[PDB]
Each structure stands twice: as structure tokens, then as C-alpha cells.
Design a protein around this ligand. Structure first.
Ligand SMILES: *[C@@H]1O[C@H](CO)[C@@H](O[C@@H]2O[C@H](CO)[C@@H](O[C@@H]3O[C@H](CO[C@H]4O[C@H](CO)[C@@H](O)[C@H](O[C@H]5O[C@H](CO)[C@@H](O)[C@H](O)[C@@H]5O)[C@@H]4O)[C@@H](O)[C@H](O[C@H]4O[C@H](CO)[C@@H](O)[C@H](O)[C@@H]4O)[C@@H]3O)[C@H](O)[C@H]2NC(C)=O)[C@H](O)[C@H]1NC(C)=O
Ligand SMILES: *[C@@H]1O[C@H](CO)[C@@H](O[C@@H]2O[C@H](CO)[C@@H](O[C@@H]3O[C@H](CO[C@H]4O[C@H](CO)[C@@H](O)[C@H](O)[C@@H]4O)[C@@H](O)[C@H](O)[C@@H]3O)[C@H](O)[C@H]2NC(C)=O)[C@H](O)[C@H]1NC(C)=O
Ligand SMILES: C[C@@H]([C@H](O)c1ccc(O)cc1)N1CCC(Cc2ccccc2)CC1
Ligand SMILES: *[C@@H]1O[C@H](CO)[C@@H](O)[C@H](O)[C@H]1NC(C)=O
Ligand SMILES: *[C@@H]1O[C@H](CO)[C@@H](O)[C@H](O)[C@H]1NC(C)=O
Ligand SMILES: *[C@@H]1O[C@H](CO)[C@@H](O)[C@H](O)[C@H]1NC(C)=O
Ligand SMILES: *[C@@H]1O[C@H](CO)[C@@H](O)[C@H](O)[C@H]1NC(C)=O
Ligand SMILES: [W+6]
Ligand SMILES: [W+6]
Ligand SMILES: [W+6]
Ligand SMILES: [W+6]
Lengths: 49, 383, 374, 48
């Protein structure tokens, strides 16, 4: 958090901090059908925009 | 006026018992349906595009063919593809119940109403993997051609492997191109890149002969190499090419327990049950096109609604339903093995997601490279 | 020694053109021209293929603008088909169309130009919009291929159901992304729907770049297409006569090369009772795929691994004051800007920068014991 | 890579024994022998 404050101090940008929708970090896993590689976790939210 | 009669054309190609077929399709009179089938058997010699298209279109021009039950004695998947095309253009329910018409066709037309009495490529592949589990054949390679469904096959194998704690070893995946010639010895090299003792070959029978020939030229048909193939590779168990290796495991339909008249009767039952379920849910049935020359004008008048009733048929306590892609949901499968007598022998059975093999240990030739070793449980040496 | 070539063409005039091209090939074993016009439907078309063409033992079949029944029917025997004007990507799938070549590139190859255009303008961050059908997915796969042949990345890929008239959701999905460069693949009527929504969503003004293909600047799609759009047109792409001429030259060359070999069998004649493939089919096909004709009326004719025309040239076109203006050409590997200046969709005449960083960056974190207390 | 041309054994052995008696990280990955007395229609040479 303090590091994010430092980054906001150096580079001026507004931030909207939020937690992960799940409880994991970011690991790739198979889809429910058709076998599609999909990341779950923080990266799952980062890749989905 | 009177219970409406739907026109179901039963097409038989080659040597077939029309008597036994008609005696098993007219005897069991069905009154549990809101419609009664008007079965009309038709014979046909040739299985070329023009002959099939002409025969079917004339069969729809003469009588009101609401459904078409198709059967042949050959091993031509092109039959099934042609039937799918006809079923797509005319929006006519077609059921490939036997022969090449029963050979699975992946990625059918969007408006196709062509269903086949056979297991899906994914399902066959799954059965193959189950066989590899039953005899602990964890290390294997896959060889497929450009035939429609190779992608679904390989992807099914991969999807089944990844989500498993079993030590699978997929060494090589070959994509043999049969569209061109093989004078540059590309296929020979690809096959020469095979190291696995178990090879899963996916292609047509005609292609399978060539691939097995080249593999024999390289040295992959002898002992120490076990080939496993789907249904469209073996096909007719009474017709075995010389190029086919002895010890070739294959997943086929239970033709012994599932006879041809039973197949015809089941198909007719499917079309009829679908028509009945449609006439009791929307009180109408799509008018049979009496011409293949005006299927471009009355296209906005023709519908693709019978599918949702064709995909879901329960008959005589048996679930003869299909899938969206056009394959049987719960097919009775049989695992056959090519013996030294160059004949197909049933060595396994697959039913209701259950695999029952004939032998516990797979009968391999006791060569001078195979030994029987005994061990005693002793930690930590033998845990 | 008589090698028949077939063709399904638009008119008797083009038939006479085919005939004259074949006659010229003979002038420059002797060929004879045999042709018909398109049938009203696919079944009649297949039957026509058998009774009129394959009945004369054609080594190959030229097809102009739904070649599908002809590809299926001829492919049954492995008789090669040469598409003269079809650009649909579905004909590039060897699984479905086993022996199909074409003297024009598929729509999706326009992506290569798009890629070169990104090089031509240093667009490192892009949004891709494709229709959720075969052609759209082909274009997506192809561009992701070009982007992951050199680390380049797609900021997002959006897909829409063909025939959907309100695409506002998708475009709002594209507003939230940073990248202001937008690539589109869609049919005419869908191009129209996206252009309309886009404008109503004010995405056609300053800051936004729109890069598109040929279908998205054709016919009705032009009627509502925003100004400053960049698009492509296949050069000679609509001259059926030229492509007939070139196809006939290539096929004649291929026939003669094929007949320079040994153990050549003839193709099947009638359909009735013949269910085996033409044994020399795959080899004849190999010959076409590897044919080379340097002095072609439409430029240099060669085929790639999918049997698609390679080294095609495209006009790079810009819509200026509702008029289509040529701003450049795509050769084989390089973009060439002409003296006519590009007018972009937006403010001024300077090339925009598709990298507008948002001031609000949604930072995400996870509850960890020593670093992030919640 | 050699053919059956006389000397090829002298050659391969000269290499092998120069290598073997050296404190240098030589690494001989392959030694091919090509039969130029037969045709090359089976593409053997190509695969070597
Ligand atoms: C073209 O595209 C634009 C998009 O840019 C369309 O504008 C969009 O229209 C939709 C539909 O009206 C707007 O709705 C969102 O819709 C959802 C879900 O429900 C709506 O549909 C239900 C059926 O699926 C229906 O039952 C709903 O009606 C009940 O509930 C509402 C209250 O939600 C009540 O008022 C009704 O009486 C019904 O009891 C409803 O019609 C909805 O949940 C969304 O709501 C939340 O967020 C919005 C802010 O975004 C907020 O205002 C709401 O109060 C709610 O908290 C929301 O309404 C959508 O907003 C439109 N989008 C835009 C950008 O305007 C346009 O209609 C299209 N036109 C054409 C011609 O195609
Ligand atoms: C279609 O039009 C194109 C114009 O945009 C043509 O491309 C041009 O082709 C010419 C002729 O070869 C090139 O000029 C030469 O380029 C070479 C290569 O050096 C450059 O590229 C290498 C990598 O390959 C790179 O390392 C260098 O830094 C250079 O960038 C030079 O060696 C020569 O001296 C000479 O300059 C043009 O560079 C090239 N333009 C572009 C933009 O690529 C194309 O040839 C035309 N096609 C046909 C069929 O005529
Ligand atoms: C394309 C091949 C096939 O898919 C295939 C065969 C071998 C392969 O290695 C790979 C693919 N087909 C296409 C359709 C043909 C049937 C047909 C003809 C006319 C109308 C409708 C349908 C029959 C052969
Ligand atoms: C072809 O069909 C006709 C009747 O339809 C039959 O008389 C003939 O015997 C058939 N051909 C063969 C080879 O059996
Ligand atoms: C299939 O038929 C059964 C018979 O009752 C019905 O319950 C089921 O809903 C049907 N399935 C679908 C998908 O309609
Ligand atoms: C083909 O059409 C184009 C027009 O776009 C032009 O080259 C000419 O009219 C035609 N070429 C030939 C050689 O006939
Ligand atoms: C071509 O050669 C092959 C032998 O490899 C065989 O089919 C036959 O000898 C020739 N074919 C014909 C049709 O004569
Ligand atoms: W002369
Ligand atoms: W002369
Ligand atoms: W002469
Ligand atoms: W003469």
C-alpha cells in the first residue's frame, strides 16, 4: 500500500484499490468446456480488463 | 382425416435382407405415437454423389419423404458427408445407420439434420484412453490426418490428459497431409519420428492402408508397437486390408448385438417419435419438399425445428437420442482386435460409461524381449 | 491426349473468354474448353458438376462468384478447384475443402497489411473487433499469429453475434480499454451496424483510428461509413476475365508439367458407379500448388500452403469527404504511401497515438500477512 | 558425413583418435555413412 503511495507520488495517477474476486493469486487453468486456457486470480482480472 | 402418415424412405445399398428388415419394421405396430410411419424401402446400387442426390431427390419428388433412413455396406465416409449435404440443403432428416454413412463426420452443416448411429470422435478417443488405462499404456503418440475431427480428437486426448493425476506421456503428434502426394518422403519421416510403443491413428480406412503401409516400411507394424484406431478406420469387419497390422486394436459398433433390421427399426422409430413429439407440441409437421430444384425459393418457408425432437428419442426403454454435433449420446461400443488370422475378434465392450475387457493382461507375443519379474514388498526398496 | 478444363462462370461472355484463354494456352496434347454457368441451387449445382463437367473428364475446375458444392463434388474425386473470385476463409480449410485453390487471397490475409500498417505507424496497442463467425475467427487467429511472431500484443478481442443490430455493449467494452486504434472484421451489414453504433457512441472523432478490410468499405457499408477510415481493395480483384486468363495459363502449365511425368491416369468420367478418387489428383494438385507464372496479367501468381494466392497487392484507400481516395499500396511485404495525404477520422492531419493512458488505474491486491493488511 | 569412398575409415578413425587423446571439449554428434552405390529413391540419404 505504502509502495503504491510512493508510485502515486512519483508518477501522478489516481488509483482505485480493490481485492481479488477469489482468494488465489494468479494461476492458469482449463475451462469448463472446449478446453480453453484461462487464468484465474488477480491475473484473471488483469487479463480480463 | 385419419392418423397422418409420414414418409420414411429406407435406403439399402448392397447385399441386405429386405425381408427380415421389413418384417421387423412392420410387425411392431406403434400406437403410442401421435403419428404413424409409412415405411417405403428403396434399393440403390452406386454410392456416388450424383446417384445418391438423384435417388434421394427423386424419392422426395415421387412420394412425400419426411424422413430418410440410410444404410450401406461400404466404408465411404463420403457417403455420410453427401447425406449431410443433402440433409442441409433440403432440410430433410437423414439417418446414417450403417456402413460409411454411419462413419462419424465432425463439424456438420449448421442447418444439417443428419444424425449417425455411431460414437463421437471425442468419445471414441476417451474409450481408447480408458483401454490405455486398463493395461497401463501411459506412454503413447498420436497420428492424425487432415480428416475432419482430428482437432477434436487430439484436443480431447490433451484435455483428458491435463486434468488427470495419471503419468501420461504424449511424445509425438503427427499431422499427415493426404491432400498432396508423398514423393518427398515427408510422411515416411514424420512416422520415423515416432518413438512411442502405442500409436493412436486417426484417418480414413483408405488413408489407414497407406499409413500402415508406410509405417510397415519404416518398422512400426511389428511387435512392440500397438496401434489403436477409431471406427471409420476398421469399418467393415468382414473386409480387412493386408496392410493392416496384426494386433490392431479398434473401437467399433456392436454389429452383432445391434442388427441391421434393428437399426432400420430404430431409425424409423426416431423419425416417427420426433414427428409425433412435434405434432403434439406445435401441432404441425414441415411439408416434404417435392423438388430439389426449388429449395432456394421456399427456403424461408422451410424450418429446422425437427432437430430438437430428433436429438431426443426414447424408444422401447432404450435412449436412442443424439447430440447437437450429430452423434449418438449413449452408444453400445465394442473393442475388437485384429488377430494373426487377419480377422476381427471382440476383446472388449463399452457400455454406459463402463469398460469391460475380455482379458486382464493384454495377450502379447512372448518374444525374447519380454520377461516376467517377481518382487516382494519391502520398504523402502519395494513399497 | 485431350485434357479437358472445366469452369463455372457468370455469363456466356465469360464462357467465351474462358474458351479463348484456353485456345491461347494451346497456341502458346491439346486442351479443349468445357464450361457451364451457375445453377440456381447447390444440389442442381453438384449435379451440373457431374453431368456437364466431370462427365468430360476435367483435370480441374475454375470457379467464379458459393463454390462450396463444386469443391465438395470435385473433391470427392480429388479433382482440383481454382476459385477465381471467392475470398471466404472457409475454403482454406484442407479438412473441408481438400483440393481447392484460388487466384485471390482470403479476406483474413488483409491482417498482414494491418500488421504492416501497425509497423507503418508504430501502433503497439490495439483493439480487435471481429464477427463471431468463421471469417472473423480466422482474422483473429491470423492477426494474433502476426502479433505473436514478434511479441506484439492484442489489448482486447471483441466478438459479436452476426445480425446483431445493437453493438453498444461491445463498443462500451472497447471504450474502457486504453488503446484507441480499432481494427474491424465484419460483413457489409455488420460493418454498417458497427459504424452506426460507433458514431452514435462518438468513437469516430479525434483520437480514434479505424482500420478495416474490403467488406467493411463495400456497398451499403459505405453509405454509413465514417470519414477518415482506412480500408483495402484487392487490385484486379473483381476482373473475372483477367483471373480466368491467368487461371487458364496456370492450369495449362500445370497440365503440361503433370504430363511431363509417368504413370498418369485419366480422371473419372461419369459419376454413376464411380466411387474411387482420381489417383493422379493429389499429384496434379501438388503441381498447381507449386506452379509459377511470372508474366501474369494480374501480377505474379503463386500459391501458399493453403492454396491461397500469395504476394497479392492491395490498394490502401481512405474515405475523404465521403469519397474513396487511394492513399497507398501494399506490395508483397512493404507499405508504400503515395503523394496523396491521409486524412484521419479525427482532428488535424497528424497521425494519432493509440496509447492514451488513463489517469485512473484500478490497482488490485490480495490480503497477505506481512504486506497487505485488510 | 562420409561415403564409401576409400579412406573414409582412415578419416573417421583419425578424427576419433585425435579427439580421444585430447584435453579439449570435442563432441562428435554423428557419423553418417552414405551408400552411393544404390539409387536414392527410398530417401535414405535425405533422412540421414
Ligand atoms: C441499444 O443499446 C443501448 C445500450 O447502449 C440500450 O440501452 C440499454 O437498454 C437496456 C434495456 O432497457 C438498459 O437496461 C439495463 O437493463 C438491465 C436488465 O433489465 C431490463 O431488462 C429486463 C429484461 O431482461 C427487464 O425486466 C427490466 O425491467 C425491470 O426492472 C427495471 C429496473 O431495473 C424496472 O424499471 C422495470 O419496470 C422492470 O420492472 C429492464 O427493463 C438493468 O438491470 C439495468 O440496470 C441498472 O443500472 C442502470 C444504470 O446502467 C440503472 O439506471 C438501473 O436503475 C439499474 O440499477 C439497466 O436498466 C440499459 O441501461 C440501456 N443502456 C444504455 C447505455 O442506455 C438501448 O435500449 C438499445 N436500443 C435499441 C433500439 O436497440
Ligand atoms: C514493393 O514496394 C516496396 C516498397 O515499400 C519494396 O520494398 C523495398 O524493396 C527495396 C529493394 O530491395 C528495398 O531497398 C533495399 O533494401 C535492402 C534491405 O535493407 C533494408 O531491409 C533490411 C532487412 O531486410 C534491413 O536490415 C535494413 O536496415 C534495410 O531497412 C537494402 O540492402 C538495399 O540497399 C536497398 O535499400 C527497400 O528497403 C524496400 N522497402 C521496404 C519498406 O521494405 C518491394 O521490393 C516492392 N516489391 C516488388 C515485388 O517490387
Ligand atoms: C473434403 C472431403 C473430406 O472432408 C475429406 C476427405 C479426406 C481427407 O483426408 C480430408 C477430408 N470430402 C468433401 C465433401 C465430399 C462429399 C460431398 C460432395 C458433394 C456435395 C456434398 C458432399 C466428400 C469428400
Ligand atoms: C443394379 O440395380 C439393378 C436394379 O436396380 C439390378 O438389376 C442390378 O443387378 C444391380 N447391379 C448389380 C451389379 O447387382
Ligand atoms: C427430452 O425428452 C424428455 C422426455 O420427457 C424431456 O423430459 C426432456 O426435457 C427432453 N429434453 C430436452 C432438451 O428437451
Ligand atoms: C480488368 O479490370 C481492370 C479494372 O479494374 C483493368 O485492369 C481492366 O479493365 C481489365 N484488364 C484486362 C487485362 O482486361
Ligand atoms: C503406377 O505404378 C504403381 C506401382 O508403384 C502401380 O499402380 C502401377 O504399376 C502403375 N499404375 C498404372 C495405372 O499403371
Ligand atoms: W496446331
Ligand atoms: W502447331
Ligand atoms: W500442333
Ligand atoms: W497438329
Amino acid at each position: 500500500i505504502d509502495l503504491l503511495i510512493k508510485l502515486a507520488r512519483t508518477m501522478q495517477f489516481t488509483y482505485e484499490v480493490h481485492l481479488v474476486a477469489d482468494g488465489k493469486f494468479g494461476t492458469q487453468e482449463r475451462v469448463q468446456n472446449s478446453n480453453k486456457k484461462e487464468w484465474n486470480g488477480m491475473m484473471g482480472e488483469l487479463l480480463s480488463g | 382425416k385419419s392418423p397422418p402418415s409420414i414418409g420414411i424412405a429406407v435406403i439399402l445399398v448392397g447385399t441386405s435382407d429386405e425381408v427380415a428388415i421389413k418384417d421387423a419394421h412392420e410387425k411392431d405396430d406403434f400406437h403410442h405415437l401421435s403419428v404413424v410411419p409409412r415405411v417405403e424401402l428403396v434399393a440403390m446400387n452406386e454410392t456416388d454423389p450424383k446417384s445418391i442426390i438423384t435417388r434421394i431427390c427423386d424419392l422426395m419428388s415421387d412420394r412425400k419423404i419426411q424422413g430418410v433412413v440410410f444404410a450401406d455396406d461400404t466404408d465411404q465416409e463420403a457417403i455420410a458427408q453427401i447425406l449431410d449435404f443433402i440433409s442441409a440443403q433440403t432440410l430433410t432428416p437423414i439417418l446414417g445407420i450403417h456402413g460409411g454413412s454411419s462413419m462419424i463426420m465432425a463439424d456438420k452443416d449448421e442447418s444439417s439434420m443428419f444424425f449417425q448411429f455411431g460414437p463421437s470422435i471425442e468419445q471414441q478417443a476417451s474409450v481408447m484412453l480408458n483401454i490405455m488405462e486398463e493395461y497401463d499404456w501411459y506412454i503413447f503418440s498420436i497420428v492424425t490426418t487432415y480428416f475432419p475431427g482430428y482437432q477434436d480428437f487430439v484436443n480431447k486426448i490433451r484435455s483428458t490428459i491435463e486434468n488427470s493425476f495419471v503419468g501420461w506421456e504424449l511424445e509425438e503428434v503427427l499431422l499427415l497431409d493426404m491432400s498432396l502426394d508423398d514423393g518427398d518422403c515427408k510422411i515416411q519421416n514424420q512416422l520415423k519420428k515416432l518413438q512411442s510403443p502405442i500409436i493412436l491413428l486417426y484417418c480414413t480406412k483408405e488413408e489407414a492402408t497407406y499409413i500402415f503401409e508406410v509405417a510397415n516400411s519404416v518398422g512400426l507394424t511389428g511387435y512392440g508397437y500397438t496401434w489403436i484406431v477409431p471406427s471409420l478406420v476398421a469399418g467393415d469387419t468382414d473386409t480387412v486390408p493386408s496392410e493392416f497390422p496384426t494386433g490392431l486394436i479398434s473401437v467399433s459398433y456392436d454389429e452383432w448385438d445391434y442388427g441391421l433390421p434393428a437399426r432400420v427399426r430404430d431409425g424409423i422409430a426416431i423419425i416417427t417419435t420426433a414427428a409425433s413429439d412435434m405434432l403434439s407440441e406445435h401441432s404441425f409437421i414441415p411439408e416434404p419438399k417435392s423438388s430439389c430444384y426449388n429449395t432456394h425459393e421456399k427456403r424461408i418457408y422451410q424450418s429446422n425445428m425437427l432437430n430438437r425432437y430428433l436429438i431426443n428419442v426414447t424408444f422401447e426403454g432404450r435412449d436412442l437420442s443424439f447430440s447437437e454435433d450429430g452423434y449418438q449420446m449413449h452408444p453400445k461400443l465394442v473393442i475388437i482386435l485384429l488377430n494373426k488370422e487377419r480377422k476381427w475378434e471382440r476383446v472388449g465392450k463399452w457400455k454406459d460409461k463402463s469398460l469391460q475387457m475380455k482379458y486382464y493382461v493384454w495377450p502379447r507375443m512372448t518374444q525374447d524381449d519380454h520377461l516376467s519379474i517377481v518382487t516382494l514388498e519391502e520398504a523402502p526398496f519395494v513399497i | 491426349k485431350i485434357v479437358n478444363i472445366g469452369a463455372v462462370l457468370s455469363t456466356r461472355k465469360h464462357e467465351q473468354m474462358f474458351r479463348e484463354a484456353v485456345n491461347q494456352a494451346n497456341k502458346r496434347i491439346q486442351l479443349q474448353a468445357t464450361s457451364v454457368t451457375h445453377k440456381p441451387n447447390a444440389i442442381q449445382m453438384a449435379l451440373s458438376v457431374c453431368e456437364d463437367l466431370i462427365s468430360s473428364q476435367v483435370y480441374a475446375i475454375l470457379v467464379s462468384h458459393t463454390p462450396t458444392p463444386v469443391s465438395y463434388t470435385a473433391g470427392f474425386y480429388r479433382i482440383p478447384v481454382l476459385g477465381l473470385t471467392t475470398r471466404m476463409s472457409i475454403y482454406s480449410d484442407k479438412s473441408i475443402h481438400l483440393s481447392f485453390l484460388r487466384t485471390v487471397p482470403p479476406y483474413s490475409h488483409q491482417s498482414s497489411v494491418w500488421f504492416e500498417m501497425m509497423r507503418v505507424y508504430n501502433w503497439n496497442h490495439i483493439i480487435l473487433l471481429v464477427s463471431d463467425d468463421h471469417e472473423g475467427r480466422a482474422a483473429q487467429k491470423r492477426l494474433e499469429t502476426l502479433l505473436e511472431e514478434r511479441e506484439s500484443k492484442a489489448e482486447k478481442v471483441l466478438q459479436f453475434d452476426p445480425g446483431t443490430k445493437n453493438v453498444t455493449a461491445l463498443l462500451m467494452e472497447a471504450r474502457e480499454l486504453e488503446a484507441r486504434v480499432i481494427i474491424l472484421s465484419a460483413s457489409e451489414d455488420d460493418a454498417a451496424t458497427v459504424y452506426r453504433a460507433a458514431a452514435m457512441l462518438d468513437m469516430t472523432g479525434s483520437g480514434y483510428v479505424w482500420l478495416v478490410g474490403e467488406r467493411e468499405i463495400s456497398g451499403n457499408a459505405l453509405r454509413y461509413a465514417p470519414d477518415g477510415i482506412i480500408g483495402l481493395q484487392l487490385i484486379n480483384g473483381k476482373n473475372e476475365s483477367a483471373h480466368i486468363s491467368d487461371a487458364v495459363g496456370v492450369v495449362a502449365q500445370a497440365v503440361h508439367e503433370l504430363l511431363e511425368k509417368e504413370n498418369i491416369t485419366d480422371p473419372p468420367r461419369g459419376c454413376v458407379g464411380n466411387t474411387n478418387i482420381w489417383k493422379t489428383g493429389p499429384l496434379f494438385k501438388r503441381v498447381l500448388m507449386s506452379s509459377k507464372y511470372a508474366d501474369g496479367v494480374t501480377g505474379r501468381v503463386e500459391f501458399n500452403e493453403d492454396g491461397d494466392r500469395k504476394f497479392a497487392q492491395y490498394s490502401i484507400m481512405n474515405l475523404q469527404n465521403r469519397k474513396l481516395v487511394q492513399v497507398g499500396i501494399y506490395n508483397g511485404t512493404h507499405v508504400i504511401p503515395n503523394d496523396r495525404k491521409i486524412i484521419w477520422p479525427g482532428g488535424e492531419t497528424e497521425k494519432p497515438r493509440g496509447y492514451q493512458m488513463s489517469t485512473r488505474l484500478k490497482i488490485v491486491t490480495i490480503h497477505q500477512e506481512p504486506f497487505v493488511y485488510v
